[PDB]
Structure 1
C-alpha cells in the first residue's frame, strides 16, 4: 500500500549466527567492521539458509 522514492537492496552472504548483527544498533564483528545499519533504519531484512 506504500510508495517510496528509492529502495536499496544491499546483498551479501554471512553465516547463520551473524544474522542477528544485521539489525539496528547491533555490535559485533559484522555490525562494526562489515555492514552497519543506522539506528533509524526503515526497511526489511531478509535472510534464508
Structure 2
C-alpha cells in the first residue's frame, strides 16, 4: 500500500519491517516504486495478495 512505502528504509521500524521484510543496517543499494492500479486493481476487489 502506498502510504507506507516510506516505511521501507534502512534503520526504520514498522509493521512490514518488523514482521515481513527489513533491510540490514549496513545495506547499500537502490529502491524503486511506482503506481500499479492499471494492472493490479480489480472491480469488487482482489484477493490474491495476503
Which TM-score applies when normalising by structure 1?
0.63
Which structure has the higher relative contact order (CA within 8 Å, separation 6+)?
1
The runs of at least 4 consecutive aligned structure 1 residues that moved more than 4 Å come to: none
Q: CA RMSD in A?
A: 0.8
Unaligned runs of 5+ in 2: 36-50
Which TM-score applies when normalising by structure 2?
0.62
- Paired residues in the alignment total 35
Unaligned runs of 5+ in 1: 1-14
